[PDB]
Amino acid sequence: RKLRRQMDIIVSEVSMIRDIREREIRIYTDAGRICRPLLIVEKQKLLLK
Amino acid sequence: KDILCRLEHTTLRKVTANTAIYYDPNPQSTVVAEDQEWVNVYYEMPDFDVARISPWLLRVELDRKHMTDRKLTMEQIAEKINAGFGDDLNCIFNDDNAEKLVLRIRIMNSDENKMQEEEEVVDKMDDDVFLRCIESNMLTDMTL
Amino acid sequence: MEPDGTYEPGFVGIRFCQECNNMLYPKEDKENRILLYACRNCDYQQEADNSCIYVNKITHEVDELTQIIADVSQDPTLPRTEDHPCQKCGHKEAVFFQSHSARAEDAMRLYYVCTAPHCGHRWTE
Amino acid sequence: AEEAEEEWERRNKVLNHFSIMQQR
Amino acid sequence: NNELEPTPGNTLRQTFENQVNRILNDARDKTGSSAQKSLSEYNNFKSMVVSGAKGSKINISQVIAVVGQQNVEGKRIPFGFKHRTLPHFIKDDYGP
Amino acid sequence: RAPSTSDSVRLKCREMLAAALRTGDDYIAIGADEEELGSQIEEAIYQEIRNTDMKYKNRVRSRISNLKDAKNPNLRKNVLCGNIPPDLFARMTAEEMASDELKEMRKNLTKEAIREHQMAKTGGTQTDLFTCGKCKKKNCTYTQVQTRSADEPMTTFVVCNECGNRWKFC
Amino acid sequence: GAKKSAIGQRIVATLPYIKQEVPIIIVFRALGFVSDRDILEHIIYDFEDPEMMEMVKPSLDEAFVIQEQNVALNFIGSRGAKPGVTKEKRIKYAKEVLQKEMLPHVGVSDFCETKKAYFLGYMVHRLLLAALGRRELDDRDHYGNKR
Ligand SMILES: [Zn+2]
Ligand SMILES: [Zn+2]
Ligand SMILES: [Zn+2]
Numbered sequence: 197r198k199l200r201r202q203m204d205i206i207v208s209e210v211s212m213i214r215d216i217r218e219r220e221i222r223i224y225t226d227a228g229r230i231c232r233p234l235l236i237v238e239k240q241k242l243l244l245k
Numbered sequence: 246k247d248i249l250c251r252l253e254h255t256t257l258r259k260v261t262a263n264t265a266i267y268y269d270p271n272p273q274s275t276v277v278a279e280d281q282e283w284v285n286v287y288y289e290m291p292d293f294d295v296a297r298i299s300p301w302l303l304r305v306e307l308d309r310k311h312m313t314d315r316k317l318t319m320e321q322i323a324e325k326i327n328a329g330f331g332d333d334l335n336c337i338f339n340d341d342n343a344e345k346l347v348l349r350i351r352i353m354n355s356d357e358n359k360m361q362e363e364e365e366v367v368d369k370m371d372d373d374v375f376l377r378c379i380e381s382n383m384l385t386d387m388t389l
Numbered sequence: 390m391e392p393d394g395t396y397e398p399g400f401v402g403i404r405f406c407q408e409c410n411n412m413l414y415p416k417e418d419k420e421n422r423i424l425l426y427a428c429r430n431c432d433y434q435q436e437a438d439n440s441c442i443y444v445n446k447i448t449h450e451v452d453e454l455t456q457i458i459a460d461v462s463q464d465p466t467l468p469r470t471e472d473h474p475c476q477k478c479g480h481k482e483a484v485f486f487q488s489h490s491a492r493a494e495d496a497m498r499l500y501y502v503c504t505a506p507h508c509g510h511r512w513t514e
Numbered sequence: 515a516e517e518a519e520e521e522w523e524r525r526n527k528v529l530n531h532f533s534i535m536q537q538r
Numbered sequence: 539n540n541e542l543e544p545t546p547g548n549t550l551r552q553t554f555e556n557q558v559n560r561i562l563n564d565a566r567d568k569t570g571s572s573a574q575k576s577l578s579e580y581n582n583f584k585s586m587v588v589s590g591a592k593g594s595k596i597n598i599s600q601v602i603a604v605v606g607q608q609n610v611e612g613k614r615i616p617f618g619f620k621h622r623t624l625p626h627f628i629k630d631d632y633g634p
Numbered sequence: 635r636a637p638s639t640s641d642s643v644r645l646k647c648r649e650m651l652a653a654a655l656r657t658g659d660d661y662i663a664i665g666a667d668e669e670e671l672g673s674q675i676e677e678a679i680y681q682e683i684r685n686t687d688m689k690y691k692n693r694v695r696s697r698i699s700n701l702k703d704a705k706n707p708n709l710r711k712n713v714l715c716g717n718i719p720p721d722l723f724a725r726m727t728a729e730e731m732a733s734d735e736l737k738e739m740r741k742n743l744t745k746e747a748i749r750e751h752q753m754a755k756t757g758g759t760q761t762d763l764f765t766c767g768k769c770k771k772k773n774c775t776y777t778q779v780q781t782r783s784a785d786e787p788m789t790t791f792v793v794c795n796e797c798g799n800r801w802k803f804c
Numbered sequence: 805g806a807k808k809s810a811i812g813q814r815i816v817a818t819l820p821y822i823k824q825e826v827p828i829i830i831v832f833r834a835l836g837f838v839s840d841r842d843i844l845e846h847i848i849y850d851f852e853d854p855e856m857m858e859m860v861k862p863s864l865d866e867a868f869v870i871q872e873q874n875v876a877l878n879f880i881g882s883r884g885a886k887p888g889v890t891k892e893k894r895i896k897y898a899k900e901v902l903q904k905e906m907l908p909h910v911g912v913s914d915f916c917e918t919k920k921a922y923f924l925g926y927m928v929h930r931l932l933l934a935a936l937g938r939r940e941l942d943d944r945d946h947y948g949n950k951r
Contacts, residue, residue, distance in 0.1 A: 216461050217489065228951020246748060264445035268417070268424045268437070276440055279390055286698065289647055289691055300417060313744045320692060340699035342732050344392040368528060373415065378809040380445070402854045403844070403861075410839035412864055429531050429868050447855055448937055456853075456938065468628050486630055489621055491937045495550045498540045516875045517891070523869060527808060547756045560758065590787045590804045596778065618943055 201236075250316050258384035260317070262308035262346075266376060269302040272351070277304075280347055283339045290337075298335075298354045303376040307346035321389070322348070329387050330379065350379075400441050406433050415442055453488035454500065454511065461486070462504035472501055476512055480505035554632070555614055559607075562634060566606040570599035636670045637677045643686060647694060648673045654701035655710070664714040671713070674720040697724060700731040708734050766794045774799075813862035820905060823883055828928060829867045833876035834902065835921040840864055846925025847932075859932055 197212065199205055208231065213222045236243045269275050272295050275284050307322075323336045335351035352375075403412055406428065413426035413433070424437035461467070462484045473481035484502040488494035500513050523529065544553040574595070577584050587593045600606070607614075615623060622629060639645065651672035655661055661668050675697065683690050701710055709731065712718045723731070733741055764774035773796045780788035793800040816825035832843045844851055847860065870876050874895070880902075881894030903920075904912045910923050933939035942949065 214464075216458075216464050219458075226951070230947070246752075258446075262446060262449075264443070265441050266443035267440045268415075268442075269440075270422055279394070282390070286702075287695065288650065289643075289694060314748065316748070320696070323692075340696070340732075341730070342699065342703055342705075342737070344390070344394070345396075366533060368530065370528075372417070374808075378806060381809040382805075400854055402851065402857045403840075405841050410841040411868075412840050412861070430871055444858060447858065452855075452937075466629050468630070491934070491940055493551065496540065497542075497550055497554070516870075516872075516878070520869065520879075545756070546751045546754045552756075556756070590789075592782070592787060594788050594790060594804075596790075618946065 247316070253315070255315055255317075255389050256385075257387050257389060260307055260311055260322075260389070261305050261384060262311075263306035264380060265304055265306075267302040267304055268300065270300055272298075275302075279344060280304075280339070283343075283347075284337070284349065287337070294354055294356050295335075295351065297356050297360075299352045299372050299375065301372055301376055303350055303380060305348050305350070307348060309341075309346055312341070312346070317389075319346070325389060326350070326383070326387070329383075398441050399439060400444060401439065406431070408433055448492075453490055453494050454513065457511075459502070459509050459511070462502060470501070472514070475503055475508075477508060477510055478505065558632075558634075562607055566599060566604050569603045570595060573598060573603050636673050638673075639677075641686075644676065644680065648676045651675055651694075651698065654698045655714070657702055658704065658707060658710060660707065660711050661714055664711065666714045671720055675724055678721045678724045693724070696730075703732060706732060706734050706737070760795070764792050764794075766797065766799050768794070768799050769797045771796065810862055813859070814866075815863065819880075821884060821901065822880075826880070826883060827863075827866050828924075829863055830870060830876055830879060831902075831924070832921070833867065833870050833873060834880065834898065835917055836873060837921065838871060838873060840867070843867075843925075846922055847929045848925075855936075856932070859936055 200207060200210070200212065209225050211224060211229070211231070215221065267276070269277075273285055273292070275281055311317075319338055319341055323338055326336050327334055333353040335353055336348065337351075338348045339346070404426070405411075406413065409428060409431045411428050411430060413428050413435075415437075416425050416427055417423075418425055424440075425434050426437065427434045467484050467486060469482045470485050471481060472483045473479060475483075480503055482504055484504060485499040486502075487497065487499070498513060500511070502511055519534065542550075542553075544550050545556060548556065577598075579585075583598075587595070587598070596606075609615075617623060619625065620629070622631075627633070639648075649672070652668040655668040655671065676694075679690070679693050679697075683693075703709070713720065713723055729741075759775050760773075761776055762772055762774075763776075765772045766774055774792055774794045777791045777793060779791050780786070782788075787804070789802050789804045791800065792803055815828055817828050818825050829843070832846070837843055837846075844860070848856060851857075870879065877895045877898045878891050881898040884897065887893050903914065903916060907920055907923065910916065910920050930939070934941060
């Protein structure tokens, strides 16, 4: 997650998913998914300065 | 609500709570500790043809929470199982005051020509797979 | 012989051989009147140890509490509570949830799970 | 014999392995 | 807390969805009765309802008081987003 | 009065009934012999059947387990004394001789648990607002019908439960 | 009726191209695994759960009829068509379908049969969890499950 926000991982395709109930970490980089930007919130505060 | 017990299609699978396959050599002296004095005090049963029956025991368990919800007894279950498959099927149970409702089933060996009398390398029915067919046919076809 | 004891004789899951690595089928020896186990591909045989070899109609005990690990508190998508008296140590910020399965569990009682290090336990209130 | 004994085994499945090795 | 008495005829989860049905129904009907007495006969909005057209008592609360429950196929809103409905809410939240 | 018989099967069943009363050591303080009362119970069962069949052996099994229950000492002491007659003990109409102590309280809540099943059902309705003009009571309900329709205006239909009455709100 | 009386525990999946339905445990015999210890490892990595055993126990009986790996390669190609009475030609067809046709995304090489066996076990274990009582049903209208 830290390297994804430092212009090292393509955020327009690579998606990271962590699940605990199924213990399955799925990562899909194929075409067909719809993504959109969001405001990252860190420590119940807006990261945007 | 008394007529509801006769009209509702109460399946036999819902009544039975658990079913296990045990290995009981001596029928009078079983290996189960909690169900030892029940199969021993019963002596009026003609135990003359039970020495060459099927040693494999198929003990079923009846749910007590289902008895109080559908209003059923223990004398109406043994009289129906023996009247479905045939007379070559033994049935026994205990009172509804112990720790759980159990029911043991056995076979009725004629002790005459049921032991390789005519050889015939075909094998009628193996004793290990004989109880699996009845266990899966009584919980669906037989209806109280 | 009283309605108080539970039923847990110890059902064996599966046994492995030492030559074929297959599940052994139960059989009976009429020469010794005992219980033995053998397969079909080989001729390996061994003595028994118990009697319960089959079970039918599962799902009766509390199954939603098991089949889960203590890593459910690392997900920040779960709310916290103010319960601090624990059964091991004493830490607040416990995680509570239902069951989330097929039957979803008829009991709506919450399952308090702590998040403090050095624990690995689970209970209910 | 894998093509002659398989069709008859799935039809009824009432046999034992002791009768197959003895014939061979 | 494992102390609620379920309704005889259903389970425990089917009882919770039934107890909250009469709470939200009485909540949207009590507030609508208070708005009926506030509007006088001079208001032209009530004249459209008293005349008998495409408008009744339920249409007044949905624009001033409260709309109500938006059920789907009779049943309530199911779960299709990891036992939730929207990511804006927390898990295990049965809020109205 | 101890009845006697000549059948071989009947003489064996009377001896097994005496062993059920021995468990507990209750016949010593009362004074009744287990052999005399054991023959009176088997005689009452054979009087109604008068035949040796599988059903005759089912009734005997239901009477031995009721006497071997160590959790109900008061149920067995009532037969050895003079509270419960020996012939009436095997004439049914009692629903399994095994209550008292704590079992009697379980049977009371058993019939009450299934009785309340047909009381609340799945719903309720009944808002109790409209007044019926046929039985001077307010047993009317509402029906949120007609949302858009066509040119017909919407109207909440009011159908009274009792006495069978219905009309329109507008 | 009177044979096995346990048809409900069967699986008989519908493999591509294949006419009728064939069991899935026969494929494990062709992947180079002739023991129940290795096949159970592909399904779940923790066999210490007695609840997950009663579902796979009746399915293990269908594997004792075919023990040799060469025999499992013939049963698959025999149901596709009928190239006469030569059993040798039916082996080559089952070799290319298992690699190039069956699961092409995991690899179509010859040495990929080892990696392909572990991928099939996870698919079987996931279906058994929802068919027993430990997993819900997947939604079809879920946009995350579509492209
Ligand atoms: Zn073996
Ligand atoms: Zn803790
Ligand atoms: Zn009326």
